[PDB]
Amino acid sequence: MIRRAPTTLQLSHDDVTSLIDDLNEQKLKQQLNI
Amino acid sequence: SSSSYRDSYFQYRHLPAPHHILYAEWNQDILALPDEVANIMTSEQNSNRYWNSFHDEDDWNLFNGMELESNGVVTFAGQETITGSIFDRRITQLAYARNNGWHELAL
Amino acid sequence: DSQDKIIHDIRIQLRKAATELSRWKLYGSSKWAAEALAGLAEAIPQNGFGLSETEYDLYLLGSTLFDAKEFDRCVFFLKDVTNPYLKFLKLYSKFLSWDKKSQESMENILTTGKFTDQSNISSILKEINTFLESYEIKIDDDEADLGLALLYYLRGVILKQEKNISKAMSSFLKSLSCYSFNWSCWLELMDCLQKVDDALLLNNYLYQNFQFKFSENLGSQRTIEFNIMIKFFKLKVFEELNGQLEDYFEDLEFLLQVFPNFTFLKAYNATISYNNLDYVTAESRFDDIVKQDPYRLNDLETYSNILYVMQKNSKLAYLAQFVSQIDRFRPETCCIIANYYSARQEHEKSIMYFRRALTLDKKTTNAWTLMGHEFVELSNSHAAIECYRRAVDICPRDFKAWFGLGQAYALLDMHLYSLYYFQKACTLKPWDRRIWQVLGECYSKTGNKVEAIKCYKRSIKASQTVDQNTSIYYRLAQLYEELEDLQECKKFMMKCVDVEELLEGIVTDETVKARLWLAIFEIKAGNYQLAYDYAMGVSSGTSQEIEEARMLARECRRHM
Amino acid sequence: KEIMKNLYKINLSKYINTEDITKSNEILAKDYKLADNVDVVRSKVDICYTQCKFNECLELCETVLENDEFNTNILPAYIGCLYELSNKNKLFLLSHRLAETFPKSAITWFSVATYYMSLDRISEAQKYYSKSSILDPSFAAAWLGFAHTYALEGEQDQALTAYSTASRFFPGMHLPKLFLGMQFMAMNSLNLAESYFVLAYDICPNDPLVLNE
């Protein structure tokens, strides 16, 4: 009887792309204020 | 500066001969593993046979054309067929019976 | 009673023995000393040195600069010291600096030596003599310290490397007399020995006109009869050279009792079984070593050597993976793996490891013959011949090298050009059946039949078992047939068939041809009845053999 | 009474109040001459294997194996423990030793198959788990490994049938149910994965694997 690796999940592509889009948003809006 | 004073890692004085650094490649040699790579699909067959050598005659006769299916139903080849579900004890003796036992029609 | 008192004496001395030697930064004997104490049978620190606090500071500078491999820097600071203890250190640093440098200078040169078979070295030697004369004991005195005794060891070893034999042993005996329990001192005295007669020459000297400085050594130890390395002397030299054994047995079991757990002894004891071609018993002996001591790249070259003869490639693949995991710089670990690669018929890789194994330590001449063998299986005879050839330049008295070289020519049609090599090998091991049989074949293949008769006749006596003579008998009988005397060959022909009866019907192939020929001649003799039983007895041979006898059986039964 | 209670309690299942089985095995160890017997070291090995304390696993395993080279009670745990250290070579020697001695027993063929596993030979030792399972029914290890060989590389459809066979023929073990649940999650089929996960949790309450899944 042997156990395999328990299921683990890392950062997906959708969430990292959401963060990249948002981070473009706050690297884009602030220079308008400047 | 200060180079040779730290002794926190493998240095030139830990190995016996400081001139062994000339070769310094024998560490990066993947020594060949025991059995199948002596054949260099044939290697696994050779390895299969090599381990397959360890049977009794009747025992090997049982597993000549042995095949086990995923659900657990069993196919036995008689050199008839003895298809039956495994984990019931009586079936394998039935395969034993017609393998070594004497069966005959007599007209 | 007395043995237990000895045991308590041994522990005290080996504690001292490993102390100063390690304290004096020589590991040839220091490594021996502890393992010897480690294997000693179960039954405050000890230290002392006549050093002033001013000069003792220089000792630490010298000591730590030694093992940091900066030998030359140690010499410079320790130049002006006058104490004999530190004087040894300075020159020892000078010596090892040369030894390490020479190794660095020469790595691509495989063979070592001089064809016909200093000034930098002589500088060390003069300093020894200059300091020895100035110092006010100059040995031969009861009040002789360890440092002076150790100083003579450096003098002895430095002299030998100059090839000033017959002077080094004198220095070594003086060093051993003032201080025993220096294993590194004993080896360098071993290598100087060359022949068994000289072993007897010196063995007597250690007995009649030899005595230890009882002042330096502890009590109940200076006695030669109760000493240890005098005993360890007997075990090593009489067997490494394979000389005549004397005072050898009773010392052997005496060492087993005192040292039951000594790893070095058991491997040597295992080696003895190996040296006598006793492989089953030796395998059991070594198997204890692996279980008891898993990490010892000192005598496992013999183990893999055994396992190659054994087969079980599966077991051999166990060692090669395991041994290589420890390190790949010992001489043995590169010969352990080569055997495993050879067994799997990859010669072109296994050939390389053998050269690697020799490069690490040039003294392992046994790899040279193994080097040549793998050439033979690569069908490159030219590359092979020089290979065995180097093996006999390093030491002429190599049975294996001569035999391997003789074969390589024998594989080629140079039957006679090989007679010399085989002839040379005859002197090394005259008492072997395998060699003598080969010589006749060469003689047989060269039309020297008159000589080949006597050659095989010598082979017949050397064979331990009669069954091995079955092949010799048939071919020997053939040699008479071509000497136009059929009557003479009948006598040997009787013996070969009679061996089959004496071996409860061995029914071997070379008797099958014997019985067929004997029955054929008996038909010409007119004795059909005496020829009938021969045909039926050989009726269990090959397909052509049985039909030849069956037809002859019908021929003789017709006239019966 | 007390010694026999401790002797029985050695063999009790783990995952529940393991400290109790502990204090029982020490009180049995020193007080009585049974300090290093077969079953006590077997229970210690089982505790370590459950707790993934694998170096103590091995050291206990060789220290008991050096006496009995063919003690079948400990061989499954030993084999798994070598597999997880991936001591390919010790596994090879054990496979050879067991093959030359016990061809009929399924333990040896299980060892050979897990040797093939350690060398990433799922397709080959598929057959050797088949052989081990048929040579001995009612063996969780062989059939479970067979299902693992089904599940690791492709051919996912029938891994469900294999693990279902494990569940039905081997009731009372949470691991087959958990494996069916995680496989169903692997198809991205959720609710049935939940069903089998809660089934496994019901079978065994204290298991990091099932709760993690």
Side-chain angles (χ1 to χ4, degrees), chain A, chain B residues 1-79 81-106, chain C residues 2 6-43 45-56 58-117 119-137 139 144 146-212 214-221 223-444 446-544 546-547 549 551-553 556, chain D:
Chain A
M1 183 278 288
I2 62 170
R3 84 151 201 161
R4 84 189 61 99
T7 59
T8 58
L9 183 63
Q10 70 275 17
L11 274 297
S12 68
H13 183 74
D14 63 358
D15 58 358
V16 71
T17 43
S18 75
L19 193 145
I20 197 166
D21 291 331
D22 181 75
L23 183 62
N24 312 308
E25 188 276 334
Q26 70 274 16
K27 72 166 67 67
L28 183 65
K29 66 175 180 290
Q30 81 283 18
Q31 76 258 19
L32 174 59
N33 292 339
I34 293 163
Chain B
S1 69
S2 64
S3 175
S4 172
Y5 294 98
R6 49 192 318 198
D7 68 357
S8 69
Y9 53 95
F10 212 64
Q11 294 180 357
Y12 64 91
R13 51 180 184 284
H14 286 116
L15 73 165
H19 83 83
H20 285 331
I21 62 170
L22 294 174
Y23 304 71
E25 293 179 353
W26 309 91
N27 275 356
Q28 294 82 17
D29 186 74
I30 301 299
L31 73 164
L33 61 83
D35 195 358
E36 73 275 18
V37 75
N39 296 115
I40 202 167
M41 70 307 288
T42 317
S43 70
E44 59 89 25
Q45 183 66 42
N46 204 247
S47 68
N48 185 24
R49 181 179 66 83
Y50 168 69
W51 301 128
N52 199 5
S53 175
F54 295 115
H55 295 105
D56 291 331
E57 292 322 312
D58 63 358
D59 189 358
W60 170 222
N61 287 135
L62 189 65
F63 293 98
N64 289 323
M66 185 65 205
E67 182 65 26
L68 171 43
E69 293 179 354
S70 44
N71 58 357
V73 55
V74 187
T75 62
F76 275 103
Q79 295 177 357
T81 288
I82 311 93
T83 187
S85 178
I86 193 66
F87 293 100
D88 191 313
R89 286 67 195 192
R90 62 179 60 88
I91 69 163
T92 187
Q93 286 63 233
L94 294 174
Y96 292 165
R98 62 175 296 282
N99 186 0
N100 56 19
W102 171 52
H103 47 80
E104 60 85 20
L105 198 146
Chain C
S2 69
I6 292 171
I7 297 302
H8 157 256
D9 191 18
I10 308 314
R11 280 197 196 175
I12 306 162
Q13 184 69 15
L14 277 296
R15 283 181 206 163
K16 183 182 286 186
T19 304
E20 275 91 4
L21 295 189
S22 73
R23 192 65 65 187
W24 289 122
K25 298 286 210 186
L26 61 83
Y27 319 115
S29 292
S30 164
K31 182 204 170 99
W32 194 60
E35 65 183 1
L37 201 155
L40 194 144
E42 202 278 328
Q46 286 73 17
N47 58 65
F49 273 129
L51 277 296
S52 83
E53 303 305 313
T54 62
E55 69 206 350
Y56 175 79
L58 274 77
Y59 172 75
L60 281 297
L61 174 64
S63 198
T64 189
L65 270 296
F66 154 81
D67 43 1
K69 300 292 178 67
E70 287 189 355
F71 300 84
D72 288 340
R73 199 204 179 130
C74 178
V75 178
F76 171 67
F77 288 79
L78 203 63
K79 186 180 289 293
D80 202 74
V81 69
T82 65
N83 190 294
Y85 285 120
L86 294 174
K87 173 62 73 174
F88 165 83
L89 183 63
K90 179 186 79 171
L91 296 173
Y92 196 86
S93 179
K94 269 178 76 166
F95 176 52
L96 271 294
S97 179
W98 178 78
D99 304 298
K100 168 191 161 271
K101 268 195 188 51
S102 72
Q103 297 291 341
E104 295 190 44
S105 178
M106 182 179 72
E107 69 275 16
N108 63 7
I109 301 299
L110 302 182
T111 180
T112 187
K114 175 161 207 309
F115 191 18
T116 190
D117 190 354
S119 292
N120 300 322
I121 301 299
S122 303
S123 171
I124 280 176
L125 186 59
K126 293 185 288 293
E127 181 68 22
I128 297 169
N129 269 341
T130 297
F131 184 83
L132 204 41
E133 296 180 356
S134 57
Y135 182 76
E136 57 268 48
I137 291 299
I139 209 62
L146 187 153
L148 195 149
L150 183 62
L151 191 145
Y152 265 119
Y153 177 39
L154 183 61
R155 179 175 176 270
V157 68
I158 193 66
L159 264 180
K160 181 176 178 181
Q161 193 257 310
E162 195 271 332
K163 309 207 79 166
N164 196 354
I165 304 97
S166 72
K167 289 189 69 65
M169 284 73 74
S170 89
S171 176
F172 282 158
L173 298 198
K174 295 182 185 179
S175 180
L176 292 175
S177 64
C178 182
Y179 190 44
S180 48
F181 289 118
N182 185 0
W183 194 276
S184 60
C185 193
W186 289 95
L187 276 296
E188 184 66 26
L189 192 145
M190 295 299 103
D191 186 74
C192 75
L193 190 63
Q194 67 274 18
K195 293 164 161 114
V196 60
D197 52 359
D198 301 328
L200 270 298
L201 184 148
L202 61 83
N203 190 7
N204 298 324
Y205 192 99
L206 272 295
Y207 268 129
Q208 280 86 21
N209 47 4
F210 191 70
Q211 75 284 359
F212 307 93
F214 187 77
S215 59
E216 210 292 319
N217 282 258
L218 273 298
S220 175
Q221 183 55 253
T223 61
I224 50 175
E225 71 276 19
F226 279 115
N227 201 5
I228 295 91
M229 292 180 183
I230 297 170
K231 311 292 191 187
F232 267 102
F233 181 76
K234 306 276 182 54
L235 278 296
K236 62 195 187 188
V237 65
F238 292 167
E239 298 307 318
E240 294 294 328
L241 186 142
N242 210 318
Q244 171 180 347
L245 73 165
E246 61 93 19
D247 290 328
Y248 173 73
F249 280 162
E250 69 273 27
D251 291 1
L252 196 148
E253 293 83 3
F254 165 61
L255 271 297
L256 276 296
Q257 156 191 323
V258 58
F259 292 165
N261 190 359
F262 194 29
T263 316
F264 168 77
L265 188 153
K266 304 179 196 26
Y268 163 72
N269 205 46
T271 300
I272 289 295
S273 177
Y274 173 93
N275 208 2
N276 291 5
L277 280 164
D278 293 331
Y279 63 70
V280 162
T281 73
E283 181 51 283
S284 71
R285 306 274 196 77
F286 293 101
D287 283 331
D288 189 358
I289 304 293
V290 164
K291 185 165 252 162
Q292 173 176 352
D293 194 314
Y295 300 152
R296 175 178 183 82
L297 294 175
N298 292 110
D299 291 331
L300 277 296
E301 63 289 357
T302 71
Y303 192 100
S304 171
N305 189 179
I306 288 176
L307 186 43
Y308 182 51
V309 170
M310 295 299 102
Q311 302 297 287
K312 303 167 201 287
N313 286 40
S314 86
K315 178 72 65 63
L316 190 49
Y318 171 68
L319 274 299
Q321 186 60 250
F322 166 60
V323 176
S324 172
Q325 184 62 42
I326 303 308
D327 65 329
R328 306 195 174 88
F329 301 144
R330 295 294 301 274
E332 320 313 343
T333 186
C334 295
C335 84
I336 307 279
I337 57 163
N339 271 352
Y340 154 71
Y341 264 51
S342 176
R344 284 174 29 174
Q345 290 61 43
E346 293 83 4
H347 298 74
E348 61 86 20
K349 182 63 66 68
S350 179
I351 192 63
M352 183 278 288
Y353 278 151
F354 277 114
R355 172 192 258 264
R356 155 69 157 169
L358 183 63
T359 305
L360 294 173
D361 190 0
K362 268 80 75 167
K363 313 325 295 174
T364 307
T365 179
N366 287 319
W368 267 129
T369 68
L370 277 296
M371 186 65 73
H373 284 99
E374 317 288 350
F375 282 174
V376 175
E377 272 66 12
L378 294 174
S379 296
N380 188 358
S381 193
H382 289 260
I385 62 173
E386 61 86 20
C387 187
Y388 297 96
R389 179 66 179 86
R390 284 181 204 276
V392 71
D393 303 308
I394 195 66
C395 183
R397 54 211 170 151
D398 291 332
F399 181 76
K400 297 315 302 302
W402 280 117
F403 201 99
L405 201 52
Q407 289 263 357
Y409 283 148
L411 277 296
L412 300 169
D413 297 329
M414 293 179 183
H415 291 78
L416 61 83
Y417 195 73
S418 70
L419 62 83
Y420 162 76
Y421 296 83
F422 287 130
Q423 187 276 330
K424 189 69 68 173
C426 294
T427 73
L428 274 300
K429 190 179 188 295
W431 61 271
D432 203 311
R433 173 204 81 260
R434 75 171 297 96
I435 183 165
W436 278 117
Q437 171 167 354
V438 169
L439 271 295
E441 163 59 77
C442 178
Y443 277 122
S444 297
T446 193
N448 284 339
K449 272 84 147 183
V450 61
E451 168 72 12
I453 295 312
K454 289 178 300 190
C455 182
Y456 283 158
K457 271 199 175 76
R458 160 66 51 98
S459 81
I460 205 68
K461 287 157 37 61
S463 53
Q464 313 323 140
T465 48
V466 182
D467 60 356
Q468 299 169 35
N469 308 137
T470 312
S471 178
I472 297 89
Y473 283 154
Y474 181 76
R475 153 201 61 180
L476 192 51
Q478 279 184 353
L479 304 193
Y480 281 163
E481 293 179 353
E482 63 193 3
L483 292 201
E484 286 77 37
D485 47 350
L486 275 298
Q487 170 49 231
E488 192 67 32
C489 82
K490 281 186 73 171
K491 274 74 69 177
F492 285 131
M493 152 56 87
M494 294 299 108
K495 299 185 177 71
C496 65
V497 176
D498 274 24
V499 165
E500 187 158 289
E501 183 178 1
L502 288 186
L503 277 296
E504 62 211 68
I506 192 72
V507 176
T508 187
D509 272 297
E510 60 283 351
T511 49
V512 165
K513 300 289 94 176
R515 273 189 183 255
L516 294 174
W517 184 96
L518 194 44
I520 280 291
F521 177 79
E522 276 292 339
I523 301 308
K524 304 313 154 276
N527 197 340
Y528 297 83
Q529 185 264 332
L530 179 48
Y532 168 66
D533 56 351
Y534 282 155
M536 65 182 180
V538 75
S539 52
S540 58
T542 69
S543 298
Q544 296 323 279
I546 55 171
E547 56 89 17
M551 211 165 258
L552 190 149
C556 62
Chain D
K1 180 169 215 154
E2 72 296 339
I3 185 65
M4 187 66 204
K5 181 165 181 306
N6 293 283
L7 208 45
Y8 279 150
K9 190 173 179 182
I10 297 169
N11 285 311
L12 265 72
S13 172
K14 309 314 169 35
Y15 309 96
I16 302 295
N17 71 314
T18 63
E19 68 275 16
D20 212 324
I21 304 103
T22 301
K23 67 182 180 178
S24 280
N25 56 66
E26 291 84 4
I27 192 170
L28 188 153
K30 44 189 210 173
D31 292 31
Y32 318 88
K33 303 307 297 202
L34 311 176
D36 57 355
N37 209 356
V38 162
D39 63 357
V40 61
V41 67
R42 173 165 67 98
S43 175
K44 260 190 203 177
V45 170
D46 183 40
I47 284 285
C48 281
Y49 170 62
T50 49
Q51 309 189 355
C52 296
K53 282 182 184 162
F54 286 114
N55 57 7
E56 312 102 315
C57 167
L58 61 83
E59 57 87 18
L60 286 164
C61 286
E62 292 84 4
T63 50
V64 65
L65 186 55
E66 61 94 10
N67 316 88
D68 189 358
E69 309 211 330
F70 296 99
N71 203 324
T72 61
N73 297 348
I74 193 66
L75 291 175
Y78 187 53
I79 291 168
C81 183
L82 263 65
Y83 172 56
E84 61 86 20
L85 282 73
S86 80
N87 281 121
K88 285 153 195 179
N89 184 327
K90 304 191 43 56
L91 183 62
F92 183 74
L93 69 83
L94 187 149
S95 280
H96 187 273
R97 277 224 59 91
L98 269 295
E100 80 167 2
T101 46
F102 282 137
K104 63 184 182 294
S105 65
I107 301 299
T108 69
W109 296 108
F110 167 56
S111 166
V112 177
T114 194
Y115 180 74
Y116 282 103
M117 294 297 102
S118 62
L119 307 186
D120 291 331
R121 292 180 181 177
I122 190 166
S123 65
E124 193 266 7
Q126 272 267 353
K127 287 169 320 194
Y128 277 67
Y129 290 165
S130 71
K131 273 177 183 65
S132 175
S133 179
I134 190 167
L135 294 174
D136 182 74
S138 83
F139 203 60
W143 180 255
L144 264 294
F146 192 18
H148 295 285
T149 56
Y150 278 157
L152 288 172
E153 53 94 20
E155 189 66 14
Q156 194 274 316
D157 62 358
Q158 62 84 30
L160 305 177
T161 47
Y163 279 120
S164 87
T165 303
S167 80
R168 194 263 290 258
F169 291 167
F170 293 155
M173 185 180 288
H174 76 290
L175 198 57
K177 299 290 211 332
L178 177 63
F179 282 165
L180 268 191
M182 62 79 70
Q183 197 57 224
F184 267 61
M185 183 278 288
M187 283 74 74
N188 284 103
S189 294
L190 277 296
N191 312 283
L192 277 300
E194 210 282 339
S195 182
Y196 283 84
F197 278 176
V198 74
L199 281 148
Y201 173 49
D202 300 356
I203 296 169
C204 183
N206 290 118
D207 192 13
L209 283 164
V210 59
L211 299 173
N212 190 3
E213 302 285 54

